Amino acid sequence: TPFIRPDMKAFLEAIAAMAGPTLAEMTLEEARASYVALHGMADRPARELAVIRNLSCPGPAGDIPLRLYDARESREAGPVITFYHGGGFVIGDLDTHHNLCTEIAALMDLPVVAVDYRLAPEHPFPAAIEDCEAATRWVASSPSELGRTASGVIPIGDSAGGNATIVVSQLLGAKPADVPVVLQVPIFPLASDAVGSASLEAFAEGFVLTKASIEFFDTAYKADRADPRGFPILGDHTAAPPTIVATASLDPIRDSGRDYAKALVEAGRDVVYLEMEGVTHSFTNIRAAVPSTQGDLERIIAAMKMMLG
Amino acid sequence: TPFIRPDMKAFLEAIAAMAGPTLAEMTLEEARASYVALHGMADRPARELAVIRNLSCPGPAGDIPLRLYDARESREAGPVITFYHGGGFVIGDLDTHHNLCTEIAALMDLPVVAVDYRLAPEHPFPAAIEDCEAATRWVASSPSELGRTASGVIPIGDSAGGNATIVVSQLLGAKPADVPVVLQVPIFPLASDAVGSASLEAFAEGFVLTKASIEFFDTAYKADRADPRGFPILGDHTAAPPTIVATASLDPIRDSGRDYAKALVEAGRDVVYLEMEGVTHSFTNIRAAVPSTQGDLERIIAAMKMMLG
Amino acid sequence: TPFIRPDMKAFLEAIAAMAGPTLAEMTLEEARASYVALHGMADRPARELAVIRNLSCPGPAGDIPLRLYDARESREAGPVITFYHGGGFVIGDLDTHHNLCTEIAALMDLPVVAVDYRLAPEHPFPAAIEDCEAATRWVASSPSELGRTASGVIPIGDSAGGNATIVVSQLLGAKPADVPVVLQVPIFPLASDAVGSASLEAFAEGFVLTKASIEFFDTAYKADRADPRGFPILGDHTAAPPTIVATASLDPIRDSGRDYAKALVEAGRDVVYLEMEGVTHSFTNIRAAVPSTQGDLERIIAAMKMMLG
Amino acid sequence: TPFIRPDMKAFLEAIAAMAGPTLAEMTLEEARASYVALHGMADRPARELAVIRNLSCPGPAGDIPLRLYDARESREAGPVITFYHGGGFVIGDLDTHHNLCTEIAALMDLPVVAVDYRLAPEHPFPAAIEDCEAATRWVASSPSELGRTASGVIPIGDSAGGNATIVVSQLLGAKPADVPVVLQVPIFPLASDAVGSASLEAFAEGFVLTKASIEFFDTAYKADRADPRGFPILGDHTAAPPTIVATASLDPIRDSGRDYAKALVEAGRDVVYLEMEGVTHSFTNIRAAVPSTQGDLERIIAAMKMMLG
Numbered sequence A, B, C, D: 001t002p003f004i005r006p007d008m009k010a011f012l013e014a015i016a017a018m019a020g021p022t023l024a025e026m027t028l029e030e031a032r033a034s035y036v037a038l039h040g041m042a043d044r045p046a047r048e049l050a051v052i053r054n055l056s057c058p059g060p061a062g063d064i065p066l067r068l069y070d071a072r073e074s075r076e077a078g079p080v081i082t083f084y085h086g087g088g089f090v091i092g093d094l095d096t097h098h099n100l101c102t103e104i105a106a107l108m109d110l111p112v113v114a115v116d117y118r119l120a121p122e123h124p125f126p127a128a129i130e131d132c133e134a135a136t137r138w139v140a141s142s143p144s145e146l147g148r149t150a151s152g153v154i155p156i157g158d159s160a161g162g163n164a165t166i167v168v169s170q171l172l173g174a175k176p177a178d179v180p181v182v183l184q185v186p187i188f189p190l191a192s193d194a195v196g197s198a199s200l201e202a203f204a205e206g207f208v209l210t211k212a213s214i215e216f217f218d219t220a221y222k223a224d225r226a227d228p229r230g231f232p233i234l235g236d237h238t239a240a241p242p243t244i245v246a247t248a249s250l251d252p253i254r255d256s257g258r259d260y261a262k263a264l265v266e267a268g269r270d271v272v273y274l275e276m277e278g279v280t281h282s283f284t285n286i287r288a289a290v291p292s293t294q295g296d297l298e299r300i301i302a303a304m305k306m307m308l309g
């Protein structure tokens, strides 16, 4: 039996007791609401910050809603974190990952801009990617509405947002924004197709993210298996920016993260690979229900400060 | 300050630390999802039963979904428990109270039929009552689809479901079903209007059920203050069936349950009044997070067995 | 016309046909002898028990005679029932309620200690109460002479004894004996002044206990209307022990018992309220003349077992 | 035309202009003195330290010479760095890597114990490994003669010493010393056989370490190709300690270090992979001739501090 932390196991047993409908059995609005409720009850509360401000920027389909987080009311030029939430490209929003964003802003002492990108099935692949790229380019242009100057950008995101992290870094690598990507932080990302992976079979049920949910998200999003914007393991890694890959040992898509970090080493790129032991997918947003995951996030923070130099 | 059990106080501290939005500040589906998560994560797992079966019966608006619970695959004629869930007539469903239902069925060794009645704001007062009454009459008719002959019915429900319990017993008292109500069990019910009561002021915040939530529910359901189907304290108590009223000492609507039991005594009716000390509203569905509440439920069960003979 | 059971009505008709004199018309010795004769006639025969033993304990005015009833010569530690007979504090003794005591001991499988407390007018208020309190404390101390160990006491009594039951529970509540009152069972008690009550007017004549007798007892006992030891509705109910209140629907002091049960609910205390339908005051001691009153006693017994756990 | 830093390229071109003999064309003593003279000229001078002290410990073939470096005469318990020098297992000693050792001790503020292990061809494989393992176990036991307490050990070494670093970590993993390996730092290690690698062909000549020298060292050391103590890529990686792998982009054995870091990710182990751009093998010891390599060492140091927490 795989190792599970005691506080992690208690959370999994409560989810098993709840025994709700699957995502596919709910309406879309119900599925999205259940994710709000899960993170609402499981995550630590928001940090207080000097600046929490809603903005928007132009996108290919229309305006893209954004939210700026900053512990400082005024700050000098520096890197700006551009955050993309998880949720399979189907669920999640600015509120499901709000508390985590306030934590990243507080602990990094850098500004964070979260992207409220368009969701599937209403907006299938590559809608989410289009919006994350556009928003990241916009932040990288130091617009006056943002109120602080970017000397570089730091894409970061969990799961689907970790997929978006890598894709955005590849798109900006090929066609630079006004400043470079100085660091990327894909957190338990989907980089290679998880179908057929050993982690997917081993952790298919009972570890928060299920094989059934992965298939539900896949059916809604409709990413093409040969498209590097859907599966960025297929992209060109030879100029990948400095990278921190964080995975979970109990994640059904753990091996997708392993694959990506291996590909970066194969291409000679600098990478920190951290595989959190005894916790699941989504550990960044369950920091109250599973208190030991706060320490896992803090290790990512420490790696980020190190890699920023 | 009022007495609070240590495990109860730890649960309240967790809720306070979460510092979530009010039900009114969420979308309606987010409010419903937050209740699914509250019970889902805080209650004990379901009992294993011989029979857990979805069914439906005709109602005035269309079909009424039902769920049958029975520890026995087949059984002789006997009383049948008809259960109405809490949630202000706005939230809750068959799943939010599913584990509690399996526990009632296991500990009573009687069949339980839970009612998936229509909810406000989509279906305001008296839609919930219409469906609860219709389902209870249908069970009382011993339909072949149920496979359980009813010698009598036992209305039971928590909070809004405790309101429904009393209204149904009054409606069936006035126009009998095929068999009588042999016992009713309103658990922390709303019987009289809570506005103005001492308990509402004393426990308006910080005790799971809040004054703000009570107001949210009241606005959606739109019960007429003069209608005994809304506030059954106004009804005729002179032929009330044998009753167990269970309240919580920390409940903002505690005094409404006190009022009902006093009205039963005033009318010469047999009643067991149990006020659980140092726990809150909703204690029937938080039996894992607050382990001492399992004993509270078991006291209700013991009183039911006694009052059934 | 109030509902009267057929067997109860026939007994009332026989009493009327015999047309005996009132308590004021008889001599004190004759009144006491007629009470002996009524129960000796009307009640079911005594149960055979291993132990029926006279005892005594020190009191504030000399020794208090007691009678111990137990189905077992030797038993484990457990609650001990402490019984106070009815009779207005003027008539009755250890023999008038002897068969009832044997029935309680047989059906509960607990020891019962009946108190031969001082009677008015020879010994007016508060004599009876002082003796009932002293005897209950003595039993609660597990004295060697009792022959069994008390883990708690259960005060119980009919009418004036129901008054004594509540007063004793309040006095031991304020100044504890060696073990707690774990349950009290006031049976058709006098808790509030019956003067002015609707039940006193409705059942003033022809229902075994008469208005004339109530006034007779009151003149003899001379209880202070403002003293909670005379009228324990005036006492502090906030810490009342678990309670079973039993009344009779045709009792002139029925509303007194209703008042007390209501006051317990108002104070948030656990209480079973049972109002026996279609029978009179004294139903616990007329179980042969009115055979259905045995079932009434058995309902009280069932409630006692439930409330003891 | 692979990228080469300007100061790096100047160093390589001066070496080319000298046109010195190969390792095969020199005597053993000439080769070893040649390496002493290269580092003596090319590396930065020694840091001044409170403690630079020769020690020794028992080994499998007699006493193993050690040298202790510490910026502090007296310190709290903490990890102790155990260092193994490069030189193909044929050349190098405590003096060729002395200045680098003082730098590591100064910048980490941790004690460093360098190992004077037995050299080939006089002592072929596995003599060097045996000595490195024995010395690391000795340090890990916190012997009185060490003068400070080890709470853990940190194996570190360049090239052949990077090979020894990994092998020691595997041996202590299978058979623990008194304290764990808390971090390992293999610097341009030989982990997998370089023969057949793309890096070996691309950088066979002109980049400090030549293919000819690799062959010369290999024939002297005579490591068994199937032995994980000779080629630790063959070892069990499933419990590898936290790791920092540092390589150089112009290193003929660069791909061996890539292979090892990929194998750790594949096994789910935490690893920092740093590939220094535009510098060669041996960059840790040419920090005066190529001043930009001081920054490369400082990046390794920063990663070490981060991974130690």
Ligand SMILES: CCCCCC(=O)Oc1ccc([N+](=O)[O-])cc1
Binding pocket: A035, A086, A087, A088, A089, A158, A159, A160, A161, A163, A190, A208, A209, A210, A213, A214, A217, A253, A281, A282
């Ligand atoms: C309801 C369980 C958590 C589902 C949401 C979640 O865990 O965030 C994800 C985002 C993307 C992917 N994915 O790309 O398969 C999976 C998960």
Ligand SMILES: CCCCCC(=O)Oc1ccc([N+](=O)[O-])cc1
Binding pocket: B035, B086, B087, B088, B089, B158, B159, B160, B161, B163, B190, B208, B209, B210, B213, B214, B217, B253, B281, B282
């Ligand atoms: C979010 C916690 C409260 C959830 C709802 C609940 O606890 O069940 C109730 C049902 C009905 C009423 N009511 O009628 O006011 C109150 C509460």
Ligand SMILES: CCCCCC(=O)Oc1ccc([N+](=O)[O-])cc1
Binding pocket: C035, C086, C087, C088, C089, C158, C159, C160, C161, C163, C190, C208, C209, C210, C213, C214, C217, C253, C281, C282
């Ligand atoms: C002969 C019928 C009356 C016998 C006395 C009786 O039935 O028991 C009572 C005890 C106490 C009170 N009281 O306190 O008013 C009334 C009645």
Ligand SMILES: CCCCCC(=O)Oc1ccc([N+](=O)[O-])cc1
Binding pocket: D035, D086, D087, D088, D089, D158, D159, D160, D161, D163, D190, D208, D209, D210, D213, D214, D217, D281, D282
């Ligand atoms: C004469 C300068 C190059 C030789 C010294 C050197 O570069 O240190 C090494 C140690 C070990 C290995 N090896 O294990 O192949 C290669 C190189």
Ligand SMILES: CCCCCC(=O)O
Binding pocket: B002, B198, B199, B202, C266, C267, C268
């Ligand atoms: C309203 C204050 C709550 C406790 C007071 C009571 O038990 O009636």
